[model samples]
Target: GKDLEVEKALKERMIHSVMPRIIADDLMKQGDEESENSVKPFKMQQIEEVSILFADIVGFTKMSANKSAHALVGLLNDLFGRFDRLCEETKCEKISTLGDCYYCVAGCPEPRADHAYCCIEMGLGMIRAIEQFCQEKKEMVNMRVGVHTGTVLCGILGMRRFKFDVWSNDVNLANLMEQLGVAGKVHISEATAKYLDDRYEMEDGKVTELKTYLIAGQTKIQSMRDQADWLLRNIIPYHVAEQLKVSQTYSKNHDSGGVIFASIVNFSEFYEENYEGGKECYRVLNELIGDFDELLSKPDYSSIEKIKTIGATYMAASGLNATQCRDGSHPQEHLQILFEFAKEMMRVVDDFNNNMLWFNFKLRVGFNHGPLTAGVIGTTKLLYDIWGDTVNIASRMDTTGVECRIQVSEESYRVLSKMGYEFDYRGTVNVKGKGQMKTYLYPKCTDSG
Candidate 1:
């Protein structure tokens, strides 16, 4: 009887823990046990890259704090019900509504390339829709929203009390982003930042670390805060940010993962060879670099510290660490998301290689798990960079890697492996400054074959 009771308690805990991510779980055991979605097995094959948006009504806490449960539920239903219809008309897929929070998908079971664009439009539309509703009713409530695009594993979780399911760090980040977002506004990442960078006016006045550097033939100090502000406030697109070196300096203490840098291997040579011919090729490369803007959307990744790209090389870093902040999961989860991003680049390179593009296409990647400094440099021509061996090691990974391979220290590998992931061992690599180290292949995916 004792063991059975403990098992029952554990199961109960699992149900509660799993319900937020898996909608059908709680419903299966609740009053509605016969619903088809609640009892059916999950269909996993339909899973694909899609945009997940999480939104929540913000006034519930105040309403609950001041009103009775019956009154609050009634009010919530009336308010949320209005927004629900707006989502339906926009073709946003509703996963399940939990309390005051509403979760939806833009692309899924079916892929839509414009998922982020559409989701953001929907989010903005939602804000307008609610505002109009409140005007008519003489009522108001805050709204918080987050959107992310990536792969999600959709399936069913549980047996008797079956639950519709999905999994991935991207999903978790989306929820966290929504929760941390300011009420009454939509919060987005750099990935999403790129798509809408040109369409929206962003605020970039927040202060960040400063660094010293040579600028416009003069020395000055700059920081990520300066660069990001310039981009959003000045309307500098992400693609441009990736190409031009925004003046900033190495940070003194990049604890939260807000510091980052980019090192392009022989970038100047690549640029001279490919784009010297026409402005269009230059534009294409800039567009390619803009894709990293998606990295900013990595939920909970440290406030994007800096975006740097020169010639054919591009680099970015965040102070967001998975182990640090309580606001949400560390930025490292986003770094993990970056690993998949590297794979996307590899895909392009593979296609180029197969076509005999007339040259060996080589790209090397390296990352170290540790602290670093980020800041703006110089007084006139400020530039930003990430200091610490962590930065150097990441650069070495690219330089020492066997052309077109993702080489990362065992530490990065171990972190991902602990998350129940698999990788390829590339054995010891002669990384400069760090001596010979046992490295691992940050494979595009273990089972990609």
Candidate 2:
């Protein structure tokens, strides 16, 4: 009762002295400027979905061990200064900074819809700035960031020296995200990854591809977040922006691919239109594909391999099957159904569009039936790629073709035409690398008719 009374009295003092309309400084009042400054720890705990971010310079341990105190302090000051500026821009509140470790959060004191996303962006920017800082210092001081979203308690502690801070499992997990992360790479928990699915692209760094589990302190990289809204507003370096842009672009394409696999596109817009039906549509789309790979493993569909989704398009090919194509027979027929399903997906879009959905996305599909070499790209994460005129022409058909229609090259059309595919002649068009290639639209054929 006495403690409660004392706390009540302090709340009144903070209201008048700190800021007239202050909410609660229950955390920061006791800690001095040195320990507090931008951060204060309150004793009470509140629960909410907070974005937890932890950033630390990589190789700082070696730097600290190698450099003199004066040199280390100067180098750190320069790096932390840049990081501080980045945190402020991201609207994150500084929790504490000890040596090279910097902690902050979003959606606390105030909440933002894009808080988690902002935390990621800030971490990314800090990592990049640290990279440049390292180059100038002639030391490869890599940085790692960990971000998590969860609940925590916020309050001030201590009477003589006040400290305002947040405490929770989320905080520890955030630290873990960093500790578990590779140098220069932002490590994020699955909680953070859910909302981020197909929102940002991630490439496996040094330790990610090892197949075996990673032990602590083996390798390092620089990791950062690239949120689109932040990229659009902020003055990020061109190269950094380009990297983020590529990731975001990749994510968009990947989601579109998911929609295509579901025989639908832009389900977010679909949900907006149909509401109840949107829920059903989402369920069906995700559920149908639940065992998709299993279905593909069957004999009739063994040809469809390496399926990938982006934005509203699903991409796969039969030419990717080396064993089948090696026998001189192509597996273009299975992909034909994939194309047909994609076209019918338009009906789903039209249904939602007619009702209430505001988004419009059309499927641009290209199929090529021919001999091609199959190989994977990227060392950390592999992209099973078919590099040949076939793949190039297929992509060109998608980009150059119209929405709500399926386009194929002369190679793909011949296979489908023989299999009873109806065509609307698109005539000859100049395709990239392939010179002049004849293209045609493949309309869906129904067995009923």
Candidate 3:
């Protein structure tokens, strides 16, 4: 009972909201007719001028000659279904279809000034669609189309099972144009051609021919490839993903590779309190992590490989040993690159705080460079990961470091220093598992301002 009541209320609200837009003209006509009926008995309903288009499948007899009845019907259904969709897309009202012919009209029920152009456009669409269909089928069938514009008498023509139909010399002429037309062409009556003027090119035929404009179908294959690329990058490092496609075993070791481990401060606590549950929690996590992922995708950090993101911790590295570098740079140059990347990652969190104002969004960043192992992990849902003491020390730097700053191991500090980088000595920070050790921080790196 409650569901019924809710459905009724929803339906009423929907009708109230949308009826004005879809039925505005009908309502106006009803109002006018009510006033007219008070003074006169009745008024005849008709459209003064409309555009008609008739199209026939070109060698349908020959195409279906070898096909079974089932196959022929299936083929016709597929071809006509596509044509019907194109009709709907082009805003033409489909009338009816005979054996191998389709009939439709524009500017009926309601009149439009561009009716002739609309019909011609529909004709062109039919031509292109049929060409594509034939190519797919490896069949020799083409489509012959005709369009004409003139006055028509429109009315519901049955007593019990009513049907809307048009009657006029224009319909007959359009049908005649189709009969006189050639395969693989659209034939237009002189009246329809006059309306087009110089907008479209026309060639001579039994009737005037509208020059076919090359209409290319939307290339979903290219879009799918682009999506595949985006998916591959998201799953693994771009260079690694490319290699994995060609070789089953893609494993490598870098003698000098930089690894950065970044974690959002207090993220676990924030997630527990703020995230709703399940999908919503995942959605929020993805939004935040995806933002970090996109920052790494920037051109400045393009050479860096995003290893994997876990919970609130994002792991990335630079200077991986690969057969080829897309950017044509040495992997050893990554120490400085990784440092700049860490600096930028620090800035990104500050910017994120401004947008998600309720959250402070501080990041603890740590980096180190040394010999490490890297390869695709897991058979299903693969991941590109790095391991060894270098990666472990990088993680320690982040966990042991202060919020909103970068903590780097002595190894990374020396590399950066040799590259002309300035740093403040953290002075033997008591690091976990490594005993008391000297560390470094980029004092000028915090995004406070």
Candidate 4:
């Protein structure tokens, strides 16, 4: 009885930990029962005359290119923290915010007569906020907001399709309105304009015969797959985040696992300071690295977790968040899995070199398997990192090993070879810090395969 009681408490706390991102408030109470979510599986309603607001930053692509992805996210968090407050003050429900894209709506779910006005109030506030935001952040950014009032379904859209699948033609139209708008201005549709009192100076914009149009415009459901693509999607693993959020601390020791460090060859050689220098250099790197990010996203690469990137190096590992035990579970398997990721990464570079631009680069990978500890550490900002002799040896394998090949430490070879992977011995070599040691090299991976 005590065991079940603790288990129940743990589950509730876990749910409470994630309650904010949980989105739907009532849905949790509904989940108390053993089963739910019938045909709709969610309490929802057909909302008519709801006001939709779409506000997006202009030049976001260029801005993102100028900053590292980590720094970019920090900037967004600061900016959005302000917008999130605006939603509270104006009493609007934020549908979602994808990077620089912020979507919010007033009305329905609870419905208010003043939705269109509240939406405009929020937009005006956003413009003022951006003006203030630019002066202090010392970076200039322009925002265009599109507001429209129309019918849309508000609620958990599908039982099978997952959560929040609100889609409608009017929603798409509001997106187009945003497209028609200019930066630093609030674009309102004829429908939205009618809802507002003629207090602010407004002029006729691009229009429609169905009614007068005002310019305030601007804005993937693949499977159930693409629907969840953007939600709670961050670089950290979900389970890792779950632990971190619950107790504010998460660290674990795994007796055995795999680590990989792959670096691009012939990289820094391309760095130049002339006409097509730093910007172009990172642009090239961005293209290559973005491709790597996508590879990690694929379902086929589930076991691999990207640790981090250093300069031209890419670090990843497997059997950390989940998986272990085995015949003790043969971490040899994940080490081999890391090898596959390295091979696939090689093909990624080859393909980039062939089909794309002027840069021709190769990938060299270092692999190792052993005991390690993984943890989320930081007082201000949390970072996920793994440490141990295994991790260090993995790094050495990349730094000391050759380009265009997979280098494995001696034990790495034994672990993987036992799993049927072939490797050529490189004999005894003096590795930095760790005296002379034997390492093995796997044949070069190419796009030809």
Candidate 5:
């Protein structure tokens, strides 16, 4: 009878969870067979047996310097990316990344007794994840993750345009566990410890005269190699990072790789040191680039590999990891994805410009399709770079392009033409080394702007 009460409460939350109209309708239809579903106005949904994990870094701001925040920003993004990826792998929902702390949960919106185990596993791995970053980078930072198992009150905060959140005494206790936590360890209450299996060891620790435990173990996050792999991947593609295991001198030449060099065209004019001594300038760029990386993380764009970012320019290439026909002239599907990726990048900029008042940033994208060499260079430096005419031509197109549009080389246009995407010819354009080359504007944007 009590279980029925909880189930009904959970179902109420699930229906009211902020979601697309399509999914909301589907959810209602899915529940139609069950019948008697009622909307309780102003009632927040209650969910049971959800495990919450809060991870925060200690000594994260141990030192302060002139150009240090830039490094700190990258580090936070690095950790955040790993945490999000781990959450995806471990079947947890990341509620938010707030103040360098990762807030996430397993179970609820659905129910599972396995929630505690997954949260424990993820928390342990995050402890391992930051170890090498702290020691190697010498930034002297460590992560403390607190895992608590209890019920949560979930709901939206507004009539429309709302932020979905979880509220419970359990949430605050989870955060308290983080504060009471030690460096490089996962602190867990007996509430969480009871659900985990013997595969994980729990030390009898106490907090506030209550029984608590420290999770003593590691799981699938790769304790030693991944730290090296994680740091190496900071600069290079993950596919190539795996290859670097065999030998240092790694290189691959491709016949038809598609490259995109997208630059924030007006970044110089937009950057003003007077705005809080240029901190805000880089902050904006960080947000923009962070969104770019998030876009890259999607499975739809997985075929494309981010080569690097120089200043405001973002460079990525398709066909490095994905296999293609041998010396074939046909258009690659990932190249199609690459084009879609390009348009989405522009769309992201448009969204930022519209929403972020007083700051409007424009993007110019250069696209090309040709053969290029991907290789590892320098022993200690360990740089993964793409070279030859294809990469050069791609950069040339970007340098010679205009704002708020994508410029495609003739060869690229030909490959893309084989697909359904449309392009408008830009006549003849003068290239630095090639003299004159014909180009096309991708998907046709208005000429007036």
Candidate 6:
């Protein structure tokens, strides 16, 4: 009885509170619409200018290779759940999602003037969702998206089970966009470009039989070789990865390498209280980590190499395997940039908290500079990592540091001081193994560092 009553309420809500009055009126006027069991097969087709979007997980095969079947399905369900909601929000119709590929359309079934804009918005939202999902998973995966606007044959075709789909040359072109698109990018066809016009910046993509476009245009067309370069950077730090290609068996020891350790204060407590092995827990952690990861990826912090994340701690290094100048001289500027990177990280956290009312965790950051070894390990699943006393000291700084503060060792303090960084000396603190070590603290602030 309770289930029936809940179903009754849902039907009433959709009829009265959800749908437009015009749709409601149309339903009411049809005294007896049709019997569900005796309804005859019908087919209808219309030529409409619709915006179609195709998005797929880039490197999905590799990403899912290690996961169990059940886990992979659950992950996809969680992903598609978010995409389904976005479709409803943008008043778009979901065509289908097979394997890792997702298809949706706007200005179909019901025409809207801003169909192109709605599709673009949906594409952007999906990108953000993927980023958050990957961040939460502590993995690196990106979405390749394609959007095209043109005439589509929209209709319902079926006998027993009705299937609504769109088909056209435009649809084929949209699929091609995804095939040729780069990860972490949006690709569109020329037809879609006309609809977007000056609203977005676009660039010519690698020469496809049919010319496709990229949202953020590049100066030169990126060939297969360029893509390999991009793939290398995605796996490791760009400069180091590029250097590794030059000398495959490359490893280095840097005398003035800098490393930073930043961990979410009280994250364990937060996880214990909130985590339930479900999507919500993943979403929360993803947003937090995603915000931090985005900051490190920005152009200003390009010098930093994100070492890895262990548990809730984020480890990154600068001047690790320092880039040699044309004269074979290594610049120490990475040390200063490393400090600046930590400052910017704290700001990113603050901004995240300010914007998201639900987020309230503080960050503790620590920095140290000294000699370290950097190398790639493992044969099957390659890993690039760093090691040395400097790395250990950096970890200690974060572990012993106060919440919402950036802590630095005496070695780092002296170097930063020469670089004109301001710090408040936190008198001798007890750090494990290295007892009674003097430390300097930088308070979190909103202003530029």
Q: Which lDDT values do the candidates have, in the order given?
A: 0.51, 0.50, 0.61, 0.64, 0.65, 0.64
Candidate 2 vs candidate 3: which has greater lDDT? Answer: 3
- How do all models score by TM-score? 0.37, 0.38, 0.44, 0.47, 0.48, 0.46
Tens-place lDDT per residue, model 2, 205-235, is 3343211121121101111112222222221
Q: Which ten residues in a row have the lowest lDDT in candidate 2?
A: 250-259
In terms of lDDT, model 5 sits at 0.65
* Count of clashes, each model: 62, 49, 0, 14, 0, 0
TM-score result, candidate 3: 0.44
Off by over 4 Å in 2: 1-45, 203-449
Question: Tens digits of per-residue lDDT for model 3 on 1-449?
Answer: 55555544433333222122223334435566652332111122445667888888765546644433445545655776787778768887776554456788887767888887777788778878877987887877877777778777554321111124555557767777677777766776666656666567555564344332211111444544443444444345556665777866455655677778887776645534232222343344446665666675467776676654443467777775445666766556667777777777777776777887476767788877787655543332233444455665666667778876677788777767877877888777666456786778776644554
In candidate 3, the residue pairs with backbone N, CA or C atoms under 3 Å apart (3 or more residues apart, or in different chains) clash, namely: none
TM-score of 4: 0.47
lDDT of 5 by residue, 305-413 (tens): 7765553467778776765456666445778878888888888889988988786788888888887566554332234555556676777678888787678888777
Query: Which structure among the candidates has the greatest TM-score?
Result: 5
**Of the candidates numbered 1 and 6, which has the greater lDDT value?**
6
Worst 10 residues of 1 by lDDT: 210-219
In the range 1-449, model 4's lDDT, one tens digit per residue, is 55455544444443333222343344446763422223112233455678888888877655644333345545665677788778878887765443357888776566797787777788888888888988987778899778778776544321111234344567778888887777877767778776567776576766432343453422012322222222223324677766656675566777888888888777756755465223445555656777887777677688887765553467778877554454745444555666777888888887888987665787778888887666643323234556566776777667787888788888767766776777777777787556888977777343385
Candidate 1 yields a Cα-based lDDT of 0.51
Q: Which stretches of candidate 4 lie over 4 Å from their true place?
A: 1-25, 28-40, 157-161, 207-236, 239-449
lDDT tens digits, residue span 1-449, model 6: 55555544434333333222333455445444552221211233455577888888766656644443445545665787788778778777665444457788786657888888888888888888888988898778888888888775544322211234554567767777787888777887777766675676667777544666677521222333343344344445566556766664445555567788888776545533232232344355556776676565577766777665553467777764444465555487787777777777877777878887665878888888887656554222234555555676677677788888778899778767876767888778776556778988776353586
* Cα misplacement distance, residue 192 of candidate 6 (Å): 59
**Model 6 alpha-carbon miss at residue 250, Å:** 2.9
Error of 5 at 337 (Å): 0.9
Report the C-alpha lDDT of model 1 over 1-449, residue by residue, as the tens digit. Answer: 55555544444444343233234354545545354332222233335567888878766445444332344433544555666566667766655554456677876546776777778777877778667867877666767777776666554432222234455567767776676676666766665555554555464321132111110100112333342243232222333244345632122354334222233343335434232333343343333444444434565434333344422445556534232456655545665655555565566555554665454545555555666443332222222333445665666665666545566667667777888556688777676556788877655554556
